[PDB]
Ligand binder design. Structure first.
Ligand SMILES: NC(=O)c1ccc[n+]([C@@H]2O[C@H](COP(=O)([O-])OP(=O)(O)OC[C@H]3O[C@@H](n4cnc5c(N)ncnc54)[C@H](O)[C@@H]3O)[C@@H](O)[C@H]2O)c1
Ligand SMILES: NC(=O)c1ccc[n+]([C@@H]2O[C@H](COP(=O)([O-])OP(=O)(O)OC[C@H]3O[C@@H](n4cnc5c(N)ncnc54)[C@H](O)[C@@H]3O)[C@@H](O)[C@H]2O)c1
Ligand SMILES: NC(=O)c1ccc[n+]([C@@H]2O[C@H](COP(=O)([O-])OP(=O)(O)OC[C@H]3O[C@@H](n4cnc5c(N)ncnc54)[C@H](O)[C@@H]3O)[C@@H](O)[C@H]2O)c1
Ligand SMILES: NC(=O)c1ccc[n+]([C@@H]2O[C@H](COP(=O)([O-])OP(=O)(O)OC[C@H]3O[C@@H](n4cnc5c(N)ncnc54)[C@H](O)[C@@H]3O)[C@@H](O)[C@H]2O)c1
Ligand SMILES: Oc1cc(Cc2ccccc2)ccc1Oc1ccc(Cl)cc1Cl
Ligand SMILES: Oc1cc(Cc2ccccc2)ccc1Oc1ccc(Cl)cc1Cl
Ligand SMILES: Oc1cc(Cc2ccccc2)ccc1Oc1ccc(Cl)cc1Cl
Ligand SMILES: Oc1cc(Cc2ccccc2)ccc1Oc1ccc(Cl)cc1Cl
Lengths: 257, 268, 249, 261
């Protein structure tokens, strides 16, 4: 069996065992993929977190704002997977916005320097990651990013909403590039998942609306249905979708109430 | 293995071996599913087409406009799959619109009697298949219909575009009903496929504009599609459909998956 | 001054003085438009209602399901407005769904005859009115229908939601036909208005608030679209809902 | 009247007489509006240009990346219009992307410094103009910004497409802030118009085919040489005739975005 049997897949964004990335990595492994992980800040500790996966996997450092990590990244990856092998899969699960662009902070009070850093990490970095990895990607491959539906405004999400609108744009253009390698590019738009990144009456009402609107419910504490949706895109069962967004959100975005 | 291993699935809409429904059925059978097939009008002929599938599947008659067939459907289905068994999957791959409502024929000249029948078969029937069959679906099941992106108008497709807009709306409401059974409901928005459904409309426009426009409309897909589109090849859409029938999209209902090469995400 | 100064405008859909169409007509007449009105079933009663408007307007019978009514409409309208005169504007503010397709009746329990009737009246008729009327419209003219955002499923609205999705599709093909005459076609997606038809936290989502008792903001939007001030928008939807549709909460 | 009779409206973005801001301001003055104009770099020649408007109007300098222009903006406006007088309208008609993110330059080779610059100016400044000007806006006012439908990717527009997507998100959050003041915020997504910014973005031949393409898809047709249907739409949203719409987008594109072909 194995939905992802034989596939070599890069997975960024594990920071804890609650990380959406951690769960994509797990399910991908249960499904036959061989993975290469990347980690941003506390490599020593991410290494421990990743020790908890069903199988071992190289772990490389990637600070998505660091030019040098980006230039060296294709090279380091081939070393890890064995020269003469390419990636079949890439998962961008990275995101950041300064606190001032975030929750209770006045929307107008977030300075551009702060807005720019968050756009850098959350939006521009999807393109730079694709730039780095596409030369080492096989035909029939799949790049997947993580998205939270920015098509309407809402409390707290603030300038991250903006960064996700930009990310959706970037996705459409990356797909144009990836098409040349016979590679798909897509976003999974997830419901709220109880994560290190997630984290008063505003937020609660906002997050309660998923389970309510979703004809099949939504569980903020279960990352697996979103993980499976990501693998679905990494697999050969969505061969004809690109520059697109799959909604893994219990159907919530299709229901007014 | 078997993406659809052990799953029992109803596939409607086979009329020729080049039907999207034919190719959904076959990929499904290749992936371990056991099928029930429904066919509309020329059953003797359809059985001959369905004989060409790699595995046995029983073939029931279903005129979507016939209240008795829909009434009898659930029972006839359970007869075929054995009592105490239920479907995990249902494929609606059916569509009709009179000549009047399509192609070279002026948009304003389609009488409502014709549009009505088009929308009956093409949009309403989605809800009525769900009504008939949800009673015999397992939790975690999946209903899947076929769409052609109606978000923008376009030459020739005319009143079928109006049908598909309605379908998309029915799909969101069907998702609400189905959610109570642990069942998903989604559509696949396929790019254009060399099926036989567009044929007479194509033949009629041969000399005129929108014979040309249809060709240009059609050929724009591969142009926009950042990974290309190939109208002779139905298997990328059959796969996407199976993907939705499987357990690998457990969090999506009321929704539309575009199997179109990325075409709808690009302006050119 | 007078946004609609000199325009000649057909308004359908008045049944009471709470009707969106009544308010569209009042505002339009306040802005210098001269109107032709159409009424469905209760014409003596409707004349009673339309006497309450600032000015006079011929009142013509139109059952949108009656085909001989459609065939005669344009001739009847040209007698109303006089020889050599044309319509600058058409307002379609008609809708209907059997109770079977709505509210509390289980979605699945609506017979197709009921659904098909609601669709004929609420969506196809936008096309047949456009058909009947475009040959007597001026270039620069404007056809406007009423919408309620069916992009997402919702309680109660049920099969009207479907009829509206249909309507949105028809508008876009109506726009292709209308452009052949230099005419625009659009829809106004309104927030809920306490109307005959009939009609909680819309005011919530709306950044500028929403008053279900106030038809005027929507009537005004319809008028902006009949005017020369949106000369480059067609096959489109303008949202007169206080911005509600652009906010998750 | 005078669609805009007696209204005080600020218009940014005039650089030449083929500018979309130039036509908005001209139409606005034709409709009875009293204006205050802002200009970016070439202020002396912006003054020559605005001398070509139907009525004279105060010109202020505003570089949207200059925090002190923004801090003083309100004061200089009130002083331009007289104390105790507030604005009814704000028009954001400004954008920039460095060439690296902007045509045949590969999409992947745009340095984030260049992209961040274009986003600052094309998207972020919409919010920063609202923050500065809302404290001097009357209830019932309108803020309007300029858009180009970025819902689908396309050749040439590149990272500017990404900026517009962000703008659209920004617009909906400004609507939230503006609402508290009784003020609307909305974008006009226009079809292509031949402005300094269009050139650029060979040259002549791609334009003729864009002119042709857009015109065909548009049910009411499209003339890239004529800004006045777009200026009118902006005046419509500045007027009292669109009182129930914010956080939104009005397409003045001849309907082209509604048609596949
Ligand atoms: N959790 C949710 O409800 C939610 C919903 C939809 C989408 N998303 C998106 O999913 C993705 C993963 O977030 P999460 O919810 O798993 O939170 P998380 O805390 O688990 O992950 C955030 C990750 O981003 C990484 N990161 C930050 N800066 C980086 C940089 N400079 N270079 C490389 N990596 C960097 C961090 O290391 C961390 O692994 C994000 O893109 C997020 O916006 C989250
Ligand atoms: N072919 C394409 O390019 C394409 C693209 C997008 C979507 N679609 C959709 O795919 C679906 C299948 O179409 P296709 O292209 O395979 O054409 P097709 O001719 O193979 O299928 C149409 C099917 O609908 C059936 N049908 C008609 N009336 C019926 C009724 N009264 N009761 C039961 N069945 C009835 C026909 O018997 C036929 O099998 C349709 O919904 C169509 O709109 C097709
Ligand atoms: N009021 C709201 O909250 C709301 C919101 C969005 C859209 N709309 C739409 O606006 C339009 C007007 O509805 P309303 O709210 O003014 O209520 P209304 O009851 O005043 O309007 C409905 C009109 O449709 C007419 N009609 C029904 N069948 C007809 C037929 N066969 N031929 C000709 N006319 C026929 C009725 O006579 C009536 O005048 C409808 O399209 C409705 O869907 C209403
Ligand atoms: N021309 C078109 O086809 C088209 C189509 C849709 C939308 N738009 C949008 O319309 C707006 C106006 O563009 P245009 O086409 O009229 O071109 P334009 O060149 O005439 O005007 C663009 C303006 O942006 C200004 N600008 C750049 N950086 C600035 C800054 N730091 N501070 C203040 N102003 C700055 C320039 O001075 C110029 O006045 C832009 O936002 C553009 O994206 C243009
Ligand atoms: O993008 C996200 C979206 C959610 C869902 C959510 C949104 C708003 C209210 C409630 C829940 C949860 C986490 C998300 O990721 C991040 C958020 C902030 C930062 Cl700094 C970094 C990341 Cl990675
Ligand atoms: O829904 C469809 C969509 C297409 C794609 C296409 C559209 C227009 C031009 C070229 C190709 C092709 C066929 C489709 O099905 C039908 C069409 C008509 C009838 Cl009567 C019945 C069916 Cl099933
Ligand atoms: O389209 C409409 C929309 C509303 C606003 C509303 C929507 C949903 C929940 C609550 C209120 C109100 C009335 C509407 O028109 C009709 C509805 C039914 C019938 Cl039979 C006829 C018409 Cl004309
Ligand atoms: O936003 C725009 C959109 C267009 C329409 C267009 C798109 C693509 C091909 C042809 C025309 C034209 C000009 C636009 O403004 C700018 C573009 C670039 C720069 Cl640096 C600055 C501005 Cl202000």
């Amino acid at each position: 069996t194995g939905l992802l049997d034989g596939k070599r897949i890069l997975v960024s964004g594990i920071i804890t065992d609650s990380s959406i990335a951690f769960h994509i990595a797990r399910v991908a492994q249960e499904q036959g993929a061989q993975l290469v992980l990347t980690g941003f800040d506390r490599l020593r500790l991410i290494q421990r977190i990743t020790d908890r996966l069903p199988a071992k996997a190289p772990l490389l450092e990637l600070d998505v704002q660091n030019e040098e990590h980006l230039a060296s990244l294709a090279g380091r990856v081939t070393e890890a997977i064995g020269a003469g092998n390419k990636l079949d899969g890439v998962v961008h699960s990275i995101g950041f916005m300064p606190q001032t662009g975030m929750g209770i902070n006045p929307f107008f009070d977030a300075p551009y320097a702060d807005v720019s850093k968050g756009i850098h990490i959350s939006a521009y970095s999807y393109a730079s990651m694709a730039k780095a990895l596409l030369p080492i990607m096989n035909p029939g491959g799949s790049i997947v990013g993580m998205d939270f539906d920015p098509s309407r405004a809402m409390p707290a999400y603030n300038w991250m909403t903006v960064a996700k609108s930009a990310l959706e744009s970037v996705n459409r253009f990356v797909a144009r590039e990836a098409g040349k390698y016979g590679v798909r590019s897509n976003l999974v738009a997830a419901g709220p998942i109880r994560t290190l990144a997630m984290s008063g009456a505003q937020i609660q009402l906002l997050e309660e609306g998923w389970d309510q609107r979703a004809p099949i419910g939504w569980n903020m504490k279960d990352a697996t249905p979103v993980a499976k949706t990501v693998c679905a895109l990494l697999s050969d069962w969505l061969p004809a979708t690109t520059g697109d967004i799959i909604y893994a959100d219990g159907g919530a975005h299709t229901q007014l109430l």
